[PDB]
Chain length 142, copies 2
């Protein structure tokens, strides 16, 4: 069985699928806005070994007034407890490094795969970011 | 300068203060329950200054997830947005939960402030001992005996 990763954030799943390649299975589940989960979400969550999440630095109230803390590490400390818009290239690169680091940490047996997939993906992301490329896109077809 | 830690949950701050002792400073700030304009107070602005670690609750504590995905309560959860600058984007069970929280808070402080690892480990042990003592099942029935 492949290593299994889930997230509630669709674009994290998109990026993680490119870092994971064939080394891990990445699935997204739906976070209710507001209920009952679909059988597909039951199946997608089954066997998850890692959850990838956005942190406080992406909550609007916090990002508006605590920007200086955007790089502060945030650690989930509830593990085991049982209770009673546009994506800039710069941000995509940071996400990919963080996703790579998490997959390397929790699935060290595939570290080299994750590191090289991330490097390849980052290389494509920068190629897409070239400002000259954006200008040449404005040229209409003959 | 003491290592500085923040959280948005008072109970995490309380537990973290016991684990941190004199080695780290722990402050909490208020998170609104989505609010259009939520302005920080000056007190929260100052409490968050110089924060070096944020302690968070995970998906396993969201009501919808805790109910339907109980089997995932122990699955690790990692924040991967760090550095993103968004330009564009049953008293016995409570005690068992406290013990788990304390271990996780200890582990986080040991990781991010390793110079004080032993202090965090011993403070965590002392605090866990108090939690176990408070929740000892052998004490609970005798506690019911009415006072004079």
């Amino acid at each position: 069985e492949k290593f299994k990763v889930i997230t509630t954030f669709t674009v994290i799943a998109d990026m993680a699928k490119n870092v994971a390649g064939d080394a891990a299975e990445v699935s997204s589940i739906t976070k209710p806005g507001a209920y009952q989960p679909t059988p597909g979400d039951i199946k997608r969550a089954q066997g998850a070994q890692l959850i990838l999440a956005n942190g406080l630095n992406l909550e609007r109230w916090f990002a508006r007034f605590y920007q200086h803390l955007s790089g502060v590490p945030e650690v989930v400390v509830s593990t085991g407890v049982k209770p009673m818009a546009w994506m800039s290239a710069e941000n995509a690169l940071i996400y990919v490094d963080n996703i790579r680091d998490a997959l390397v940490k929790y699935d060290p047996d595939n570290a080299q795969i994750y590191k090289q997939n991330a490097e390849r993906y980052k290389a494509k992301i920068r190629q897409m970011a070239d400002p000259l490329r954006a200008e040449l896109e404005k040229i209409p077809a003959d």
